[PDB]
Amino acid sequence: MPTPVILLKEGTDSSQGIPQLVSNISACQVIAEAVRTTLGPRGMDKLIVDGRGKATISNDGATILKLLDVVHPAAKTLVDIAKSQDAEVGDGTTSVTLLAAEFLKQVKPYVEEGLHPQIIIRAFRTATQLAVNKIKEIAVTVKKADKVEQRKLLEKCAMTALSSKLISQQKAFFAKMVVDAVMMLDDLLQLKMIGIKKVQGGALEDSQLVAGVAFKKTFSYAGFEMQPKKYHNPKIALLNVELELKAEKDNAEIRVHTVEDYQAIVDAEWNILYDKLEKIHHSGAKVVLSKLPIGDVATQYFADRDMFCAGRVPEEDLKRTMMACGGSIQTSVNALSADVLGRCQVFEETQIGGERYNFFTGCPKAKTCTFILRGGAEQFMEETERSLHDAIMIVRRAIKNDSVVAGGGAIEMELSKYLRDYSRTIPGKQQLLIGAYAKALEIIPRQLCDNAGFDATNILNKLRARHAQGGTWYGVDINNEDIADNFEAFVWEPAMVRINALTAASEAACLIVSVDETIKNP
Amino acid sequence: LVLSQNTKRESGRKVQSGNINAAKTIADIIRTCLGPKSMMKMLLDPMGGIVMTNDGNAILREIQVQHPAAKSMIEISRTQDEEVGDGTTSVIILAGEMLSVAEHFLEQQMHPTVVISAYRKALDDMISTLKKISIPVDISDSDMMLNIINSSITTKAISRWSSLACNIALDAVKMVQFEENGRKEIDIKKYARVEKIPGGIIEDSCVLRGVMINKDVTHPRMRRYIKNPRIVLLDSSLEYKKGESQTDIEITREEDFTRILQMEEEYIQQLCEDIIQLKPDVVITEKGISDLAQHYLMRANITAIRRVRKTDNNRIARACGARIVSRPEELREDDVGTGAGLLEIKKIGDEYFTFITDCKDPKACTILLRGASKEILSEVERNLQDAMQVCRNVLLDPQLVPGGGASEMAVAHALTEKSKAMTGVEQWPYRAVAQALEVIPRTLIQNCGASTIRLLTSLRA
Amino acid sequence: LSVFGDRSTGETIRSQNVMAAASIANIVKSSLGPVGLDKMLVDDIGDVTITNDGATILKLLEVEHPAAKVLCELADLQDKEVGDGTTSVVIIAAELLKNADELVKQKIHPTSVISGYRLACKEAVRYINENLIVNTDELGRDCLINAAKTSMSSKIIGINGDFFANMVVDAVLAIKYTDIRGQPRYPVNSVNILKAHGRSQMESMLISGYALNCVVGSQGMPKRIVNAKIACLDFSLQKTKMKLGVQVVITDPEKLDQIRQRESDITKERIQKILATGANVILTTGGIDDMCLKYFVEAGAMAVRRVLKRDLKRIAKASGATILSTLANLEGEETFEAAMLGQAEEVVQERICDDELILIKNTKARTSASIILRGANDFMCDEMERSLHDALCVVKRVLESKSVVPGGGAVEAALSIYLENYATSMGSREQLAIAEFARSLLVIPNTLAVNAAQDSTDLVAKLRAFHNEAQVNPERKNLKWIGLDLSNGKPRDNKQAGVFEPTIVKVKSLKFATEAAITILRIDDLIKLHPE
Amino acid sequence: PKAPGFAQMLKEGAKHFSGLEEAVYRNIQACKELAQTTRTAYGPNGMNKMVINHLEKLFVTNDAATILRELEVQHPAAKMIVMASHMQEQEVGDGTNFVLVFAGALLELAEELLRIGLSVSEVIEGYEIACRKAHEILPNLVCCSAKNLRDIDEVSSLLRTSIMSKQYGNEVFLAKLIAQACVSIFPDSGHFNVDNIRVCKILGSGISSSSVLHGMVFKKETEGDVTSVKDAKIAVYSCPFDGMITETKGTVLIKTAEELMNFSKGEENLMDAQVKAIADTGANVVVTGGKVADMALHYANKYNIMLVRLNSKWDLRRLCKTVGATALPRLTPPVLEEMGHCDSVYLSEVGDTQVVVFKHEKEDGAISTIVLRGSTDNLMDDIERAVDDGVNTFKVLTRDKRLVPGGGATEIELAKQITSYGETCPGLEQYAIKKFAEAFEAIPRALAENSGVKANEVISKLYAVHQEGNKNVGLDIEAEVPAVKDMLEAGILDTYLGKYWAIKLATNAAVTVLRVDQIIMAKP
């Protein structure tokens, strides 16, 4: 009994052609709807809980898409774009996804026509290149101008980017903190320096910016409460080496005939630890931190001689501290000298919400700070942290590039007008694709107004009419519920965000539309 | 859920390729069965029997399928067989190869409809060409008819019995012509009954100038042999029958019961002398016969046969020219069974049969097939069906065509000329059809077992 | 808060309805236009059914989602009213729904869209009646052939379209009928269609008369009658019952025999009364007993049993015979009159595909038309009879309404731009609905091109360009044109090409599509109930 | 019923195939299945593809070899042609597309002859002789024997063909960057090894911003400072940067008191001495794949030394080649001669990714790296695959020489010449050679189908214009003009060796698959 021989595995799914492509477009639209509501000064956030039961709320779309583990292949590309934009420029990852989906949405009716996708993607590439050039032309610098403080642009940039996430009504506050903080980051510019500290409890209006380093951590040994916990003008000693009785040092068997020699051996071990402690004290410092655990006895000696100590401190915060007080971490206690000894304006350790924290700050030459982030919700901790991370990284980009553009979708409207006018010049099939490009691009204000509950058709129509002639930076104003020169209203976003957004969306459309069929393997 | 919840769908080039594959397979499973060199195929039926036959139609009819286009082809084969008898030895093969070349233009992205129009033009030209290359032939001349039959049958098992087969078919068909249509009389192939009786040899089978009845004399006394019988066809039952209108009887006096009992007897008698008033010899009915009426007819020395199939009754009537009658009182001498050269009842072995032969001008006839065993006999009768079918087709059309693929090659080069004079996109499909035709002679060659390529080239050139 | 099922609201259910409508559209999107490719259905058990006529597909396709059922019923109604456009109307409905939703999918208030749609339909039908073409000047048979063969493409028989159109027009002109005293109404389905596998449609024959799918009752009874003595009889022929309850009781046995005797003699005398008239042909839906058969043979007449009632009614209408449910008179006695007889030149049973069917040729009272199909399988034959039924439908529409429309999508070709211009007049928001109506309605050329597999955007653009030119320089006697084709993949003049469609097709199509859009668009929530 | 017979029960449950039925129908059908599978693949108008593996990993692809690698196939001769194309890719680069199309066409046309009854063995003879004749005639088609070794312009123009083939949007950028790569790499370890180019994937900052470094890169952290010296002194150590632990279980032992003090102190002192000696030779940066002792990094910080970590063996090999300094398994001897030399080394941020950069200038020759930037990592996979295929193309170019006119034109000339030789063949194999010649129309056919223009008259016009010796004219890529284009001016070229090898391998695959008649298949 012979049988026909199969080509591929049993159940190898296949689906080819226009139905496959339109299915992909619909899937992208579905992904969009999961995020459509999100962006807006009156925008939105989602709550997603995992199978493990841990809740997670988010307003940044990229985080949400990470949580929405997508199985369908095409949408995985969109979620990857979300990761890309998140690593690049920040909010508008939301906007990025909406642009991608809407590009696909406008193209799909023409895909119903049997157009070879490559024509579509060629038009897309040309349009995107032209759009990027237009943005760069209408980019705005300030250091040419006169009425800019080197921070005012940064402050307003934070102002704009923030006012969609969970802390929107404290923007006038958080912008000042984040700008002043990032001003200290120079010139390493990397996020690892400034940690974020999710202290439980408290109203986030009470969240603290310290020109120094703090710990949410400690660990109880014998005397840790005994030693004084104020040090007005202290010297910081930083030990990586542990302080304990050969606890985890080199493993060795020892042999001793004379009992007195055995006595001498135990004495010599304790003399090792005493020698280390004497080196520490005679150093003249009073504060000692250690990655590795601290012997209780050494704690006792610090207590007796009024030195403060702590053990098991997480390494990242230790690096923060050493970069703060200027001292260098040490592993050899013997080679110690005053040069590697960090100094701080004042040291403390004060209760916040039941937790035992440590403080030292006021170091005039400290290029790294930290956020004590009060808040009554554990979920606020992650959400506020995400928002703050977006703020920090976007303001870093802004410092790097003195280029700003108006917000409120006005950029998108300007691009729409420019591209539509350009479309008249090129005859043939390209014209319709350019038109669809503009019609998809205009989506951003529409979603804004919809989440604002307005007649975005009146808004859009007035927008186009006024924006044909009257000024570049007119766009949606949420509170006045109509057009405004958002630029003067200080809705200021770095150009890089929108530029990268458009580029990513363009190549996303290229990728998706450049697919005809799909093969699945069990 | 949107559409139907467990209804599959498939689309486009995949569907076209799948259907073409199905058609090609359908053709392939039969490509060996054609030609005088043909193979011999036998079947396992669902319910136990054994069927062996060359005829493609039966072969396919014993095929169930899942893919639909295969079922379509099955029906096509059965239709062609019904209409003409043979050619089904070739029709599905030709269709399959037609399709196989046809698909080659699908990946040309050539849309089907234009190819279809090309096919229609091709059919028109093929019909014209074949009509140009016919030969009219006399219909009365017997030996040419026999030659035609031999030609049309020398593909199946009966070949070695060609002389007997041709004589049988000619005799049967020739003597079946209902001239009551003026000069437009029509023959029919449901009065040419075929009877399969085992034993004997093919050589023993012969045309009986009459009918065969697989029944027996009801009573010993009726003579089993009669020279010039008279035959009466009683469609009605010959016995006492239910009062159809739910009648009832309420007797009170003693004699009444015995009297009503006598009454049905008397009615039976009435029918009996009504029959015998016409001096018949033979009584036939599709219904039962009362043993009392059997008595009376015996007293009149009249042979009676009971409970015969209605079609058999019709054939007997057409044999002895008499017409069926359902009312004995309305019996007419015009329906007396005149025209029976001999009435007889023989034994084939463990079974009586009825022979009614030597009619004056019999118009009905059944063929007596006597061979080896019922399955071979069935093959024989299928072949006979095909032969007599083509014979009747000749008696409808006296035009003949040279087969053996010759007509096919004529059509081939004719269409080639038309194509090279017929520039256009449809040209390629047209010559594709032409080339597809060439495969009947090809298959002949492989079934022979010769150099197919060189032989075909020599043929075409 | 309802048990046994959840509910869906707003965007979810809107998108679901559009999704279903698009599904249904794509089910048939490949079977329209002179390059349409037919569908076929492996049922569940092998009894397949090839067909391209959309309404047939929808009926034979099981459907569960509500809106899809709505569309299916719409297709069925359209078939009950036109015959084709089930090629089209479903697509129109789905596309209008799609674009209307796309407007609503943004925010746009549905009732505004509905009002815009209503205006669009009214404007469109008015513009069509300003775009009409009248056939009265045109040659009758000419335009009839044109409309027929136009419908014949996209079907199995489009290739033989010329022959088939000839046959169809002959039949329809032969089925003339005088209506309400002022109308020459032509009855569809009056022409009889019989399928018979075997020879090709090339050999499919038109019958100048009527044809029966019946057989001779008695083999001995003759086969052909050159005389016109045709009597109809609903009244069945059996040795009669007592027919209600009449028990027969015997107290004098001497009469049972005579009782039984007349139990048949009643039918005997009825038959003899029938035959003494000289009628040689009888038909009967009721049963026919052998008693009657033998009598007929002895008379040599013609007898047929178990004929369908519609067929014999048509027989009476053709031959001029009278349907007779029984024998009776203004006086009680049961008699029969020769005036009841109908006539036809010759009646023959003939063997087509070794099955004998009964023919009736040239009834003198009223000319009848029947058509025999010849084909390979039953699949091709019954799908082509569906096609022919659509043919007769459209020709009936043409005759009933002396008015024609240029085929090949010139309709929406004009309509899109005309409605585009008219949109700006309203000034409200509804002109957006108007524009979307036009753009969606532009779907027909798109589907045409894609099924013809060429650059669809370019063909559509050229079409729109030609029509827009037809809306510039109002001296349009040399600037108004109309047309679109596929076989050469470029525009033409369908008026010259003969590609015509009946007006009522597009009119009723657009109206029903508008109603369907109004119904489905007003949806904003389904509530499910798991069964009892 | 229900019980036919078997005259051979030899099999315990398996597939026996025989009677040429499998060769005539089933095997051919499988090959045609593959042909349809990747017919859309090749073509500048060819559009990309995605597939997920059995382990649910995405693969956006246009290359045929990669996609075949991701379909776990079961029909045997399917595997035949698959792995044939696979090895072909292992040899030349692109052509997987080519060879699979060749196989499909040759098989499809051969089965037609088999049906018309030609001897299978005779089909073999005809195909073999045709392939050999085509090989003979091919060199007569070479034009534009591009000879410039290390110019950027010629090589950019050349590599444009493959890049354009597997990516139609971004020819200019990829061309210039890969050309910069090729010219930057000289013959150092022998004739421009493909392995000499490394590829890194960095998401964000779409494709246009991708760049190339004349050094080599690492996505790893750093342990001390971040500095670059215009005279950067690099030390390499395969051994873990720590005191050399004896492989034998060596437990340090003590006997009296002062042993503890002196032992810990001496450990400290001699780590200090070792790292100092390293610093004494001026080496400011050290790399190792082995474990790093905290003491060592501490002292390195004291002496301002750079550290690089967790490198795999291949990675440190790359770095060795980059700085040309010999890795030292012995921790001690920072020898002057085998000690590193780099233009600049630092740490930078791209895409929220710590990146170690060895920014370099090397006249003697260095193994450079290309930096890929953009959103979608799947697009990175596709684009880097295409770039590597182009690098292979450039390598094959360097192997010998002799660009040939692509765009099917070469193949049309092949068809015409082979046919012409066909009518001078005569013998029953004439049909075999004629069909083989016909088979080459598949390529222009495929270009048409992915181009969506009516193939037949395109091929006809191509033939007609090829009747005048215009060997440089080929299939255009333009809807407005679905007619023709002259390849040479358009610069749409390709390699002699690639076409030759693809043809030979396709021939071998065909002759193998046709040859087998009956099959045996044990249950999997």
CA distance, residue A74 to nearest chain B CA (Å)? 22
User: Is the Cβ pair C354, B189 closer than 8 Å?
Assistant: yes
Residues D464 and D395 in one domain: no
Catalytic one of A93, A299, A321, A370? A93
Query: Which residue type is seen at D222?
Result: T
Q: Identify the closest residue of chain A to B10 by CA–CA distance.
A: A15
User: How many angstroms separate the CA atoms of B67 and B71, rounded?
Assistant: 7
Q: Is B88 a catalytic residue?
A: yes
CB B102 within 8 A of CB B115: yes
Question: CB pairs below 8 Å between B and D: how many?
Answer: 31
- The alpha carbon of residue A456 is apart from the nearest alpha carbon of chain C, in Å, by 8
Q: Chain D interface, mutation test: which of B47, B109, B440, B457, most D Cβ atoms within 10 Å?
A: B109
Strand partners, A195: A370
Residue D300 near residue D286, CB atoms below 8 Å: yes
Give me the catalytic one of B53, B81, B88, B187: B88
| Chain D contact present for B460, CB below 8 A | no
DSSP state of D149: S
Q: How many CB atoms lie within 10 A of CB D299?
A: 23
Q: Is C87 a catalytic residue?
A: yes
Quick check: is A390 catalytic? yes
Residue pair B287/B271 in contact by the 8 Å Cβ criterion: no
Hey, what are B89's tokens? 């030895």
Residue of B nearest to D427 (CA): B454
Q: Is residue D391 a part of any domain in this protein?
A: yes
- Measure CB to CB from residue B68 to each of C48, C224, C376 and give the nearest one: C48
Task: Report which of A388, A362, A356, A358 is spatially closest to residue A373, judged by C-alpha positions.
Answer: A388
Q: Is A256 an 8 Å CB contact of chain D?
A: yes
What 3-state class would DSSP assign to B22? helix
Distance of CA A143 to CAs A151, A175, A405, C42, C340, Å? 11, 20, 14, 75, 111
| Domain hosting residue C314, numbered range | 206-400
CA-based nearest residue to D241, from D322, D314, D318, D300: D300
**Spatial contact of C35 and B113, defined as CB atoms under 8 Å apart:** yes
Domain-terminating residue out of D401, D426, D460: D401
Residues 6+ apart with CB under 8 A from A364: A345
Cβ neighbours, 10 Å, residue D355: 17
Residue D26: DSSP 8-state: I
Q: Please choose, from the candidates C311, C337, C308, the residue with its C-alpha nearest in 3D space to the C-alpha of residue C324.
A: C337
Query: The domain containing residue D151 runs over which residues?
Result: 146-214+366-401
* CA-to-CA separations, C215 to C238, C275, D75, in angstroms, rounded: 19, 20, 57
Asked whether residue D468 is assigned to any structural domain, the reply reads yes
User: Which of B108, B445, B452 comes nearest D455 by C-beta?
Assistant: B108
Query: What's the number of domains chain D is made of?
Result: 3
Identity at A517, one-letter amino acid code = E
The token pair that represents C6 in the structure block: 């959840």
Angle in degrees, CA D414, D419, D425, rounded to 5: 125
> Is D254 found in the same domain as D377?
no
Hey, is the C-beta of D54 within 8 angstroms of any chain A C-beta? yes
Helices (H), C321-409: 378-400
Resolution in angstrom units: 4.5
Q: What is the DSSP letter of D326?
A: P
Q: What is the DSSP string of B119-149?
A: HHHHHHHHHHHHHHT-EE--SS-HHHHHHHH
D336: left (phi over 0), alpha (psi -120 to 50) or beta: alpha
Nearest-by-CA chain A residue for D30: A7
Residue A40 carries which side chain, given as an amino acid letter? G
CB neighbour list of residue A80: distance below 8 Å, 6 or more residues apart: D203, D375, D376, D377, D378
Provide the shortest C-alpha distance from residue B44 to chain D (in Å): 6
Query: Taking a C-beta distance cutoff of 8 angstroms, is the pair A456, A449 a contact?
Result: yes
**By what technique were these coordinates determined?**
cryo-EM
Q: Is D258 within 8 Å of chain A by CB?
A: yes
Mark yes or no for CB contact B46/D428 under 8 Å.
Answer: no
Query: Which residues are CB-contacts of B416 (< 8 A; sequence separation ≥ 6)?
Result: B431, B434
Q: Is the CB of residue C367 less than 8 Å from the CB of residue C306?
A: no
Residue B458 touches partner D, C-beta closer than 8 Å: no
Q: Which of B53, B55, B312, B354 is catalytic?
A: B55
Chains that touch B (3 or more CB pairs under 8 A): A, C, D
Q: Does B11 touch chain A (CB under 8 A)?
A: yes
Residue A256 one-letter amino acid: V
CA torsion angle A201 A206 A208 A214 (round to 10)? -30
Structure tokens that stand for B376 in this block: 């071979």
Q: Looking at chain B, which residue has its C-alpha nearest residue C202?
A: B124
Nearest to D487 by CA among D394, D390, D404: D404
B chain contacts of residue C295, beta-carbon cutoff 8 Å: 330
For residue D236, the distance in angstroms to the closest alpha carbon of chain A comes to 24
Residue type, B98: M
Is D79 found in the same domain as D54?
Answer: yes
Torsion, Cα of B420, B423, B428, B431 (10° steps): -30
Half-sphere exposure (CA, 13 Å, Cβ side) for D486?
5
Residues of D in contact with B105 (CB under 8 A): none
Give chains near D: 3+ CB pairs under 8 A. Answer: A, B
| Alpha-carbon A188 to chain mean position | 17
Among the partner residues C11, C107, C457, nearest to A432 by beta-carbon distance: C457
Asked if B264 and C267 count as a contact pair (C-beta separation under 8 A), the reply is no
Q: Residue D80 annotated as binding?
A: no
Which one of D375, D380, D382, D454 makes the best mutation probe of the A interface by having the most chain A beta carbons within 10 Å?
D375
Q: Which of B53, B81, B89, B366 is catalytic?
A: B89
Min CA distance, A349 vs chain C (Å)?
Answer: 55
- What does the alpha-carbon distance between residue A333 and residue A239 come to, in Å, rounded to a whole number? 7
C interface mutation test: which of A28, A112, A431, A464 has the most C CBs within 10 A? A112
Return the DSSP state at B183.
Answer: T
Count other C-beta atoms under 10 Å from residue C5's C-beta.
Answer: 11
Q: Which CATH number fits domain A210-399: 3.30.470.10, 3.30.300.130, 3.40.50.1370, 3.50.7.10?
A: 3.50.7.10
- The minimal CB distance from B446 to the residues D117, D449, D456 is found for D117
Alpha-carbon distance D86 to nearest alpha carbon in chain A (angstroms): 17
Instruction: Please indicate if the annotation marks A92 as binding a ligand.
Output: yes
D425 and D290 inside one domain: no
Chain D residue nearest residue B48, CA to CA: D1
Q: Determine the Cα–Cα distance for residues C314 and C189; give it in Å rounded to an integer.
A: 10
CA–CA dist B343, B347 (Å, integer): 14
Cα–Cα distance measured from residue B93 to residue C474, given in angstroms and rounded to the nearest whole number: 62
* CB atoms near residue B214 (< 10 Å): 14
Q: Kindly report the CA angle at A13 between A10 and A14, in degrees rounded to 5?
A: 130
CATH number, domain with residue D457: 1.10.560.10
- Looking at the complex, does the CB of residue D255 fall below 8 Å from at least one CB of chain A? yes
Q: Which residue has the tokens 């390699």?
A: D495
- Among residues D298, B97, B185, D237, the alpha carbon closest in space to that of A332 is found at D298
Q: Please indicate, yes or no, if residue D5 is contained in any of the structural domains.
A: no
**CATH number of the structural domain spanning residue C267:** 3.50.7.10
Asked if residue C444 lies in contact with residue C409, where contact means CB atoms within 8 angstroms, the answer is yes
By C-alpha distance, the chain A residue nearest B13 is A16
Residue D355, φ and ψ in degrees, nearest 5: -135, 125
What is the four-CA torsion angle of A519, A520, B1, B6, rounded to 10 degrees? 90
Does D192 count as an annotated binding residue? no
Cβ distance B446 to D454 less than 8 Å, yes or no, reads no
Sign of CA dihedral D130, D136, D141, D146: positive
Alpha-carbon gap: D379 to the closest alpha carbon of chain A (Å): 8
The reply to whether B457 belongs to the active site is no
Question: Taking CB atoms and an 8 Å cutoff, what residues of chain B touch A19?
Answer: 11
